[PDB]
Structures are given as structure tokens and as C-alpha cells.
Write a protein that binds this ligand. Structure first.
Ligand code: HEM
Ligand SMILES: Cc1cc(Cl)ccc1O
Length: 137
């Protein structure tokens, strides 16, 4: 289930973090409006860009903590408030999060592994609801 999936992702987190973020950028290329330095790069070129690797790992490190602190895929209100109030998120709306979770779930469904894709779909929807209640547009 969901808690085992957190353990699976954490066991290879740099690889999962990069491949999920690339699945997102490749599914929604207009999302590079928020990542202008990632334009005109293949996946292999992005992986060899220092900030791409370091920011994607730090995003997925925190995402796994938010997932781990969740009850039945419902994140803590404190984690939603933190995500809304981060200066690095000043540009964002809940639709950016929705797209990330649509890409993550499709990535999981395409994997050979027994990921609980329906729990990740719930988690993404519940995080979006929590972000809106914490003040994200
Ligand atoms: C649960 C989901 C997410 C978590 C846990 C999260 C977490 C973080 C963290 C920890 C940072 C600091 C990274 C660093 O400076 O090294 C960060 C920066 C950032 N996050 Fe988020 N994030 C999430 C979703 C998103 C989404 C959906 C977007 C846009 C589609 C986004 C855009 C950014 C941007 C633009 C930065 C600053 C630019 C950059 O670091 O390259 N994040 N995020
Ligand atoms: C800044 C950032 C955002 C997301 Cl959603 C994924 C990876 C990253 O490096």
C-alpha cells in the first residue's frame, strides 16, 4: 500500500525523484514556464544539471515526509501551510500540484511494481484540497 510505496521510493529516491519530475515535465511541457533553465534539454542533460538533481531530491525528500506524516493519504494541515508559505512556491497554484500527481500516478501505473496508484491519486487530490484551505490559489 501507500506506506510501503514510501519505503520503495525512499530506497532509490534520487532515481525515482528524477524520473517522476521528468514524467511531469514531459507530460506538461508548458510547466517549464516555472523552470526556464530546463528548456532545450533532454532528460539525460537535465539529470547532469546540478540544481535539477539537488532541487528534485529535496522536493521528493519533503514529499515522502508529507506522505509519511499523512493519515489515510490525508496530509497534515501544518505540511500544507508550509508548502503554501514557502517563498519558492510564491508563483504556484494548486493546478501545478494536480499535474505533478497526475504524472506520478501514470508513472506508477506504467511501472512493473505493485505501487498502490489509487492511494497516490487520493494523496494528490487531498494535498490539493489542503493547499487550497491553507491559502494557495
Ligand atoms: C508535494 C509536492 C512538493 C514538495 C514537497 C515541494 C518541495 C519543495 C522544496 C523542498 C523546495 C526547495 C528546493 C531547493 O531549493 O533545493 C522547492 C522549491 C521549488 N518548488 Fe516545490 N514542492 C512540491 C511541489 C512543487 C510543484 C508542483 C511545483 C511546480 C510545478 C514546484 C515548484 C518549486 C519551485 C519552482 C521551486 C524553486 C525553483 C527550484 O527549486 O528549481 N514545487 N519545492
Ligand atoms: C523545483 C522542483 C519542483 C518539482 Cl514539482 C519537482 C522537482 C523540482 O526540482
Amino acid at each position: 500500500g501507500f506506506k510501503q510505496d514510501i519505503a520503495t521510493l525512499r530506497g532509490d529516491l534520487r532515481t525515482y525523484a528524477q524520473d517522476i519530475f521528468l514524467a511531469f515535465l514531459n507530460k506538461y511541457p508548458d510547466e517549464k514556464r516555472n523552470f526556464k533553465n530546463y528548456v532545450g534539454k533532454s532528460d539525460q542533460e537535465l539529470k547532469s544539471m546540478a540544481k535539477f538533481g539537488d532541487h528534485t531530491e529535496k522536493v521528493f525528500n519533503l514529499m515522502m515526509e508529507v506522505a509519511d506524516r499523512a493519515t489515510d493519504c490525508v496530509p497534515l494541515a501544518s505540511d500544507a501551510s508550509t508548502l503554501v508559505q514557502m517563498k519558492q512556491h510564491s508563483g504556484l497554484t494548486t493546478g501545478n500540484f494536480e499535474k505533478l500527481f497526475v504524472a506520478l500516478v501514470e508513472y506508477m501505473r506504467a511501472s512493473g511494481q505493485s505501487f498502490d496508484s489509487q492511494s497516490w491519486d487520493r494523496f494528490g487530490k487531498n494535498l490539493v484540497s489542503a493547499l487550497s484551505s491553507a491559502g494557495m490559489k
